[PDB]
Amino acid sequence: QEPKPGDLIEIFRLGYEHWALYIGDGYVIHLAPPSEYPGAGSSSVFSVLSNSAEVKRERLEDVVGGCCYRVNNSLDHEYQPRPVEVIISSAKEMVGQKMKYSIVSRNCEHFVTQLRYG
């Protein structure tokens, strides 16, 4: 299925899945992977800001790259999804906020599931 605004996108990476929220016109909002490795520059690996990630609005094509991906709203069988008006206004309000990008924590998934389900 083609994504509609409010849909969760599951992207199959090597060893994990990256998640994004489709907002329409080929855009997603997501917890963007960091581009600075722990201990880059002057920073210590043990910095609390190691693997800091920013919530970004980006093109779906740029985030997916060549990867396989699907819409995955299967949590709709457990939780009632919010109105798309609220999902998308909530998502836009979070742009520029930060979270730890810990793959083990699944924060990229939890970020967008909270947008869809509250």
Is 108 tagged catalytic?
yes
Q: Residue 111 to residues 41, 55, 66: CA-CA distances in angstroms?
A: 28, 9, 23
Q: In whole angstroms, give the CA distance from residue 75 to residue 54.
A: 24
Q: In whole angstroms, give the CA distance from residue 22 to residue 9.
A: 7
List the beta strands (DSSP E) in 1-118. 8-12, 17-24, 27-31, 52-59, 69-71, 98-100
Is 110 tagged catalytic?
no
Report the number of distinct structural domains present in the chain. 1
Experimental technique of record: X-ray
Range of the domain at 97: 1-118
Q: In whole angstroms, give the CA distance from residue 2 to residue 111.
A: 22
Catalytic residue chosen out of the listed positions 30, 67, 77, 110: 30
Is 30 tagged catalytic?
yes
Helices (H) and strands (E) in the chain, counts: 3, 6
**Cβ partners under 8 Å of residue 44, min gap 6:** 50
